[PDB]
């Protein structure tokens, strides 16, 4: 279960 | 020619270090307008909160110095990072305006709540929220005022906390300080607060996140109450008899309620499809919400309970969960009153160290 490294604020 | 310079941002002036230019504004904090800027030197984006003559008031001065100190002694990768203080004036004589230079997060919750999240993302954001929260808690400090407009995230999915005018140890020891919606009943119906007040917010915030909109809205401070117990349900007699009589009279008078079950409160139709192996279940977040969105302040979850919790522990890193509390030099404590002027000193005093 990997921590996410992106977040989208499009 | 000297160390500074001014720019006319609307009906405001920023006089600030040449090293910082190109100021757009960005929002107001508890009591200062804040401005986005370029750091010439560091060659990197900053925030600058200016607080106009904060010493003008027992309100201002108190809840400003707080920030000062707090900001400084604070040390955790989930709080916004202070990068500079200053004042242009010559001395206590001349003194008035402070500036605070901080890191510039990409955005803030308001419009994270907007998109639909994968469990993991949602969870992570929460995760961190709490870890930061844990931080000041671990130092006796309570934020008192967490909201979308107070949480900031970075496009890698880092997340931090803001503004420390509000933060302190328990009480009561200040009426309509906190933001209407995320007011916890022990506040709504001013009974006095303890540190798992912060948990409540997290609930709404999370709720809001899942919900799409404010969890308990409410048109006026009083109408709030209803909204809470509409969805959550009329609290126990055992709760009641703790309220002040004056107040309870009314509360009891407010019509009885079952409230909904968290499931109907938050159906799946809102959640995303689920994880690989569980822990990240819809039921589980519900089960979180369930232990945070609790009308009773005393029958509520802790943060270390919130971090034990299944939906959260999946990312559990103790070097994030349990690093040292910050150190507050105890000459300062978030309560004691001072003079019309005594304050002006303290600040300039506290500013002069930092800069």
Short mmCIF file of C-alpha atoms in Angstrom, two decimals:
data_model
loop_
_atom_site.label_atom_id
_atom_site.label_comp_id
_atom_site.label_asym_id
_atom_site.label_seq_id
_atom_site.Cartn_x
_atom_site.Cartn_y
_atom_site.Cartn_z
CA UNK A 1 0.00 0.00 0.00
CA UNK A 2 1.99 2.96 -1.35
CA UNK A 3 1.64 6.59 -0.31
CA UNK A 4 0.47 8.68 -3.34
CA UNK A 5 2.90 11.28 -4.82
CA UNK A 6 0.63 13.37 -6.94
CA UNK A 7 -2.48 15.41 -6.33
CA UNK A 8 -4.61 16.94 -9.02
CA UNK A 9 -5.82 20.50 -8.84
CA UNK A 10 -6.66 20.79 -12.50
CA UNK B 1 17.41 53.19 -1.25
CA UNK B 2 17.41 51.73 2.32
CA UNK B 3 16.51 48.11 3.25
CA UNK B 4 12.81 48.19 2.32
CA UNK B 5 10.12 49.29 -0.21
CA UNK B 6 6.34 49.59 -0.61
CA UNK B 7 3.66 48.35 -2.97
CA UNK B 8 0.07 49.45 -3.24
CA UNK B 9 -2.02 46.34 -2.91
CA UNK B 10 -5.59 47.73 -3.00
CA UNK B 11 -6.24 49.94 0.02
CA UNK B 12 -3.34 48.24 1.74
CA UNK B 13 0.33 48.87 1.88
CA UNK B 14 3.01 46.28 2.04
CA UNK B 15 6.39 47.74 2.92
CA UNK B 16 8.71 44.76 2.68
CA UNK B 17 12.20 43.63 1.84
CA UNK B 18 13.34 44.40 -1.68
CA UNK B 19 14.19 40.70 -1.78
CA UNK B 20 10.42 39.94 -2.03
CA UNK B 21 8.45 41.19 -5.07
CA UNK B 22 5.50 40.66 -7.35
CA UNK B 23 2.92 40.51 -4.57
CA UNK B 24 -0.51 39.25 -5.46
CA UNK B 25 -2.86 38.89 -2.49
CA UNK B 26 -4.19 35.49 -1.46
CA UNK B 27 -6.48 35.88 1.56
CA UNK B 28 -6.95 37.10 5.11
CA UNK B 29 -5.73 35.14 8.11
CA UNK B 30 -7.28 35.51 11.55
CA UNK B 31 -6.30 39.22 11.52
CA UNK B 32 -3.96 39.96 8.66
CA UNK B 33 -4.12 40.15 4.90
CA UNK B 34 -1.74 37.67 3.38
CA UNK B 35 0.10 37.99 0.14
CA UNK B 36 1.81 35.73 -2.33
CA UNK B 37 5.29 36.87 -3.39
CA UNK B 38 8.64 36.17 -5.01
CA UNK B 39 11.70 35.65 -2.98
CA UNK B 40 14.49 37.11 -5.02
CA UNK B 41 17.13 35.54 -2.85
CA UNK B 42 15.70 32.15 -2.18
CA UNK B 43 14.18 32.29 -5.71
CA UNK B 44 11.05 30.50 -4.57
CA UNK B 45 7.39 31.40 -3.78
CA UNK B 46 6.37 32.69 -0.39
CA UNK B 47 3.41 33.85 1.62
CA UNK B 48 3.45 37.09 3.50
CA UNK B 49 0.95 37.75 6.21
CA UNK B 50 0.95 41.34 7.37
CA UNK B 51 -0.64 42.26 10.67
CA UNK B 52 -1.44 45.93 11.02
CA UNK B 53 -0.61 47.41 14.46
CA UNK B 54 -1.54 44.14 16.24
CA UNK B 55 -0.79 45.71 19.57
CA UNK B 56 -3.85 47.93 19.15
CA UNK B 57 -5.88 45.32 21.03
CA UNK B 58 -5.97 42.62 23.74
CA UNK B 59 -7.60 40.60 20.93
CA UNK B 60 -4.99 41.41 18.32
CA UNK B 61 -1.85 41.51 20.39
CA UNK B 62 -2.54 38.28 22.30
CA UNK B 63 -3.67 36.17 19.37
CA UNK B 64 -0.74 37.59 17.30
CA UNK B 65 2.17 36.94 19.62
CA UNK B 66 0.75 33.50 19.88
CA UNK B 67 1.27 33.01 16.18
CA UNK B 68 4.79 34.46 16.40
CA UNK B 69 6.00 32.07 19.03
CA UNK B 70 3.93 29.15 17.88
CA UNK B 71 5.14 29.57 14.35
CA UNK B 72 8.73 29.62 15.51
CA UNK B 73 8.86 26.77 18.04
CA UNK B 74 6.59 24.67 15.84
CA UNK B 75 8.49 21.89 14.03
CA UNK B 76 6.65 19.39 11.88
CA UNK B 77 6.29 18.66 8.24
CA UNK B 78 2.48 19.09 8.48
CA UNK B 79 2.40 22.66 9.73
CA UNK B 80 3.05 25.57 7.39
CA UNK B 81 6.71 26.63 7.64
CA UNK B 82 7.77 30.07 8.80
CA UNK B 83 10.66 31.54 6.78
CA UNK B 84 11.06 35.01 8.12
CA UNK B 85 9.68 37.80 10.26
CA UNK B 86 10.35 41.51 10.15
CA UNK B 87 9.19 45.07 10.74
CA UNK B 88 10.31 48.16 8.79
CA UNK B 89 10.07 50.69 11.64
CA UNK B 90 13.08 52.00 13.55
CA UNK B 91 12.15 51.04 17.15
CA UNK B 92 9.43 50.48 19.81
CA UNK B 93 8.92 54.21 19.50
CA UNK B 94 8.22 53.97 15.75
CA UNK B 95 6.92 50.36 15.73
CA UNK B 96 3.64 48.96 14.33
CA UNK B 97 3.39 46.57 11.34
CA UNK B 98 4.65 42.97 11.34
CA UNK B 99 5.30 40.69 8.43
CA UNK B 100 5.51 36.91 8.39
CA UNK B 101 7.03 35.00 5.55
CA UNK B 102 5.96 31.37 4.97
CA UNK B 103 5.90 28.57 2.50
CA UNK B 104 3.56 28.71 -0.42
CA UNK B 105 1.46 25.62 -0.75
CA UNK B 106 -0.17 25.06 -4.15
CA UNK B 107 -3.79 25.16 -2.82
CA UNK B 108 -6.22 24.38 -0.03
CA UNK B 109 -9.00 22.11 0.91
CA UNK B 110 -11.92 24.14 -0.46
CA UNK B 111 -11.40 22.64 -3.85
CA UNK B 112 -9.92 19.34 -2.94
CA UNK B 113 -13.34 18.67 -1.48
CA UNK B 114 -14.29 19.45 -5.02
CA UNK B 115 -12.91 16.43 -6.85
CA UNK B 116 -13.78 12.85 -6.02
CA UNK B 117 -10.94 11.12 -4.27
CA UNK B 118 -9.51 7.63 -4.25
CA UNK B 119 -9.65 6.18 -0.75
CA UNK B 120 -5.89 6.29 -0.43
CA UNK B 121 -5.70 9.98 -1.25
CA UNK B 122 -8.53 10.89 1.02
CA UNK B 123 -7.03 8.74 3.73
CA UNK B 124 -3.57 10.12 3.30
CA UNK B 125 -4.70 13.72 3.49
CA UNK B 126 -6.54 12.86 6.68
CA UNK B 127 -3.62 10.84 7.85
CA UNK B 128 -1.39 13.85 7.70
CA UNK B 129 -3.96 16.21 9.01
CA UNK B 130 -3.94 14.26 12.24
CA UNK B 131 -0.20 13.85 12.49
CA UNK B 132 0.12 17.62 12.45
CA UNK B 133 -2.70 17.90 14.88
CA UNK B 134 -0.93 15.28 17.08
CA UNK B 135 2.04 17.67 17.02
CA UNK B 136 0.60 20.63 18.93
CA UNK B 137 -1.46 18.34 21.03
CA UNK B 138 1.79 16.71 22.09
CA UNK B 139 2.66 20.20 23.41
CA UNK B 140 -0.70 20.93 25.00
CA UNK B 141 -1.58 23.25 22.16
CA UNK B 142 -5.04 23.09 20.54
CA UNK B 143 -5.76 24.62 17.12
CA UNK B 144 -9.29 25.52 17.99
CA UNK B 145 -9.99 26.43 14.38
CA UNK B 146 -9.35 23.87 11.64
CA UNK B 147 -11.21 24.16 8.32
CA UNK B 148 -10.76 23.79 4.54
CA UNK B 149 -9.67 27.42 4.38
CA UNK B 150 -6.99 26.33 6.89
CA UNK B 151 -5.61 23.25 5.32
CA UNK B 152 -3.23 23.52 2.43
CA UNK B 153 -2.07 20.81 0.03
CA UNK B 154 0.77 20.41 -2.50
CA UNK B 155 0.53 18.80 -5.93
CA UNK B 156 2.50 15.78 -4.69
CA UNK B 157 -0.26 15.31 -2.12
CA UNK B 158 1.66 16.79 0.88
CA UNK B 159 -0.72 18.66 3.28
CA UNK B 160 -0.23 21.37 5.98
CA UNK B 161 -1.94 23.47 8.65
CA UNK B 162 -2.26 27.23 8.97
CA UNK B 163 -2.77 30.24 11.22
CA UNK B 164 -2.17 30.14 14.93
CA UNK B 165 -4.10 33.09 16.35
CA UNK B 166 -6.55 30.62 17.81
CA UNK B 167 -4.24 27.87 19.07
CA UNK B 168 -3.77 27.46 22.86
CA UNK B 169 -4.25 25.04 25.87
CA UNK B 170 -7.72 24.05 27.21
CA UNK B 171 -10.44 26.16 28.88
CA UNK B 172 -12.71 27.93 29.16
CA UNK B 173 -10.96 30.44 29.32
CA UNK B 174 -13.94 34.06 24.05
CA UNK B 175 -17.28 33.61 22.27
CA UNK B 176 -17.67 33.70 18.45
CA UNK B 177 -14.00 33.16 17.73
CA UNK B 178 -14.23 29.87 15.89
CA UNK B 179 -15.78 29.20 12.49
CA UNK B 180 -19.51 28.52 12.58
CA UNK B 181 -19.81 25.12 10.92
CA UNK B 182 -16.94 23.26 12.50
CA UNK B 183 -17.92 24.36 15.97
CA UNK B 184 -18.17 21.37 18.27
CA UNK B 185 -21.12 21.19 20.64
CA UNK B 186 -18.93 21.88 23.70
CA UNK B 187 -18.38 25.17 22.02
CA UNK B 188 -21.63 25.76 20.24
CA UNK B 189 -23.22 25.59 23.64
CA UNK B 190 -20.19 27.07 25.35
CA UNK B 191 -19.40 24.50 28.03
CA UNK B 192 -15.64 24.78 27.66
CA UNK B 193 -13.29 22.74 25.58
CA UNK B 194 -10.62 20.05 25.63
CA UNK B 195 -8.16 18.96 22.93
CA UNK B 196 -10.35 16.39 21.18
CA UNK B 197 -12.39 19.31 20.11
CA UNK B 198 -10.00 19.37 17.14
CA UNK B 199 -11.17 15.83 16.25
CA UNK B 200 -14.71 17.14 15.58
CA UNK B 201 -13.57 19.48 12.90
CA UNK B 202 -11.59 16.69 11.31
CA UNK B 203 -14.90 14.87 11.18
CA UNK B 204 -16.75 17.70 9.44
CA UNK B 205 -13.76 18.34 7.27
CA UNK B 206 -13.61 14.72 6.29
CA UNK B 207 -17.40 14.61 6.08
CA UNK B 208 -17.48 17.69 3.88
CA UNK B 209 -14.79 15.95 1.83
CA UNK B 210 -16.85 12.82 1.34
CA UNK B 211 -20.20 14.76 1.41
CA UNK B 212 -19.34 17.26 -1.28
CA UNK B 213 -20.52 20.12 0.93
CA UNK B 214 -20.52 21.52 4.45
CA UNK B 215 -21.58 18.82 6.85
CA UNK B 216 -23.48 20.73 9.41
CA UNK B 217 -24.27 24.07 7.66
CA UNK B 218 -26.58 26.35 9.67
CA UNK B 219 -27.67 29.89 9.07
CA UNK B 220 -26.95 31.38 12.45
CA UNK B 221 -24.99 30.34 15.49
CA UNK B 222 -28.17 28.98 17.01
CA UNK B 223 -29.43 27.19 13.92
CA UNK B 224 -26.15 25.34 13.82
CA UNK B 225 -27.13 23.35 16.88
CA UNK B 226 -30.18 21.96 15.15
CA UNK B 227 -28.23 20.94 12.04
CA UNK B 228 -25.95 18.92 14.21
CA UNK B 229 -28.66 17.07 16.02
CA UNK B 230 -30.78 16.86 12.93
CA UNK B 231 -28.17 14.59 11.35
CA UNK B 232 -26.55 13.31 14.55
CA UNK B 233 -29.47 13.19 16.95
CA UNK B 234 -30.59 14.63 20.27
CA UNK B 235 -27.92 13.79 22.81
CA UNK B 236 -28.39 11.82 25.99
CA UNK B 237 -29.76 13.14 29.29
CA UNK B 238 -26.35 12.16 30.67
CA UNK B 239 -24.81 14.69 28.24
CA UNK B 240 -27.52 17.29 28.91
CA UNK B 241 -27.08 17.59 32.66
CA UNK B 242 -23.60 18.97 31.89
CA UNK B 243 -24.71 22.06 29.95
CA UNK B 244 -25.48 25.22 31.91
CA UNK B 245 -29.08 25.30 33.06
CA UNK B 246 -29.79 28.61 31.34
CA UNK B 247 -28.73 26.96 28.09
CA UNK B 248 -30.00 23.42 28.56
CA UNK B 249 -33.51 24.73 29.14
CA UNK B 250 -33.54 25.59 25.45
CA UNK B 251 -31.64 22.53 24.24
CA UNK B 252 -33.99 20.18 25.96
CA UNK B 253 -36.76 22.24 24.43
CA UNK B 254 -35.39 21.55 20.99
CA UNK B 255 -37.48 18.66 19.58
CA UNK B 256 -36.18 15.13 20.07
CA UNK B 257 -34.20 13.26 17.42
CA UNK B 258 -32.90 9.85 16.49
CA UNK B 259 -30.67 11.37 13.81
CA UNK B 260 -29.51 9.12 10.99
CA UNK B 261 -27.07 6.30 10.94
CA UNK B 262 -23.67 7.24 9.55
CA UNK B 263 -24.39 4.96 6.62
CA UNK B 264 -27.47 6.96 5.61
CA UNK B 265 -25.63 10.09 6.66
CA UNK B 266 -22.86 9.07 4.28
CA UNK B 267 -23.94 6.54 1.69
CA UNK B 268 -21.56 4.67 -0.61
CA UNK B 269 -22.96 6.37 -3.72
CA UNK B 270 -20.49 9.00 -2.58
CA UNK B 271 -17.49 6.78 -1.82
CA UNK B 272 -15.15 5.41 -4.53
CA UNK B 273 -14.80 1.74 -5.31
CA UNK B 274 -12.61 0.08 -2.61
CA UNK B 275 -8.99 -0.86 -1.85
CA UNK B 276 -6.87 -3.99 -2.42
CA UNK B 277 -7.20 -5.61 1.02
CA UNK B 278 -9.65 -3.77 3.15
CA UNK B 279 -8.50 -1.45 5.94
CA UNK B 280 -9.57 1.07 3.25
CA UNK B 281 -13.26 0.17 3.26
CA UNK B 282 -16.15 2.56 3.04
CA UNK B 283 -17.57 1.03 6.20
CA UNK B 284 -14.23 1.83 7.82
CA UNK B 285 -14.18 5.56 7.05
CA UNK B 286 -17.76 5.60 8.23
CA UNK B 287 -16.46 3.92 11.32
CA UNK B 288 -13.96 6.66 11.60
CA UNK B 289 -16.48 9.45 11.07
CA UNK B 290 -18.55 7.53 13.57
CA UNK B 291 -15.95 7.94 16.32
CA UNK B 292 -15.16 11.58 15.57
CA UNK B 293 -18.66 12.98 14.75
CA UNK B 294 -19.85 12.43 18.29
CA UNK B 295 -22.01 15.06 19.94
CA UNK B 296 -20.61 14.16 23.28
CA UNK B 297 -17.21 15.69 23.66
CA UNK B 298 -16.26 13.27 26.42
CA UNK B 299 -17.45 10.14 24.61
CA UNK B 300 -15.17 10.89 21.66
CA UNK B 301 -12.11 9.44 19.92
CA UNK B 302 -8.51 10.60 20.54
CA UNK B 303 -5.96 11.36 17.78
CA UNK B 304 -3.79 8.44 18.85
CA UNK B 305 -7.05 6.64 18.72
CA UNK B 306 -7.59 8.24 15.30
CA UNK B 307 -4.17 7.09 14.21
CA UNK B 308 -4.60 3.62 15.66
CA UNK B 309 -7.82 3.44 13.64
CA UNK B 310 -7.69 1.00 10.71
CA UNK B 311 -8.46 3.53 7.96
CA UNK B 312 -5.51 5.58 9.10
CA UNK B 313 -2.80 3.26 10.54
CA UNK B 314 -2.12 1.87 7.05
CA UNK B 315 0.44 4.71 6.59
CA UNK B 316 1.53 4.72 10.20
CA UNK B 317 5.08 6.08 10.51
CA UNK B 318 6.09 6.75 14.16
CA UNK B 319 8.74 9.19 13.02
CA UNK B 320 5.74 11.12 11.71
CA UNK B 321 3.36 10.07 14.53
CA UNK B 322 5.66 10.50 17.58
CA UNK B 323 8.46 13.05 17.12
CA UNK B 324 9.27 15.54 19.92
CA UNK B 325 6.75 18.12 20.96
CA UNK B 326 7.96 21.58 20.11
CA UNK B 327 9.42 23.63 22.94
CA UNK B 328 7.57 26.67 24.13
CA UNK B 329 9.79 28.70 26.45
CA UNK B 330 7.28 28.77 29.34
CA UNK B 331 7.67 32.52 30.07
CA UNK B 332 4.79 32.59 27.64
CA UNK B 333 1.46 30.91 28.33
CA UNK B 334 -1.77 31.37 26.24
CA UNK B 335 -3.87 33.01 28.98
CA UNK B 336 -2.38 35.90 31.03
CA UNK B 337 -3.49 39.51 30.35
CA UNK B 338 -1.20 42.54 29.92
CA UNK B 339 -1.35 46.27 29.44
CA UNK B 340 -2.43 48.60 26.68
CA UNK B 341 1.38 48.94 26.00
CA UNK B 342 3.03 45.92 27.72
CA UNK B 343 2.04 44.10 24.57
CA UNK B 344 3.68 46.42 22.08
CA UNK B 345 6.90 45.46 23.87
CA UNK B 346 6.40 41.69 23.98
CA UNK B 347 5.90 41.62 20.23
CA UNK B 348 8.68 43.95 19.18
CA UNK B 349 10.56 41.98 21.80
CA UNK B 350 9.59 38.63 20.29
CA UNK B 351 10.04 40.00 16.74
CA UNK B 352 13.54 41.27 17.46
CA UNK B 353 14.86 37.84 18.38
CA UNK B 354 13.46 36.27 15.25
CA UNK B 355 14.72 39.00 12.90
#
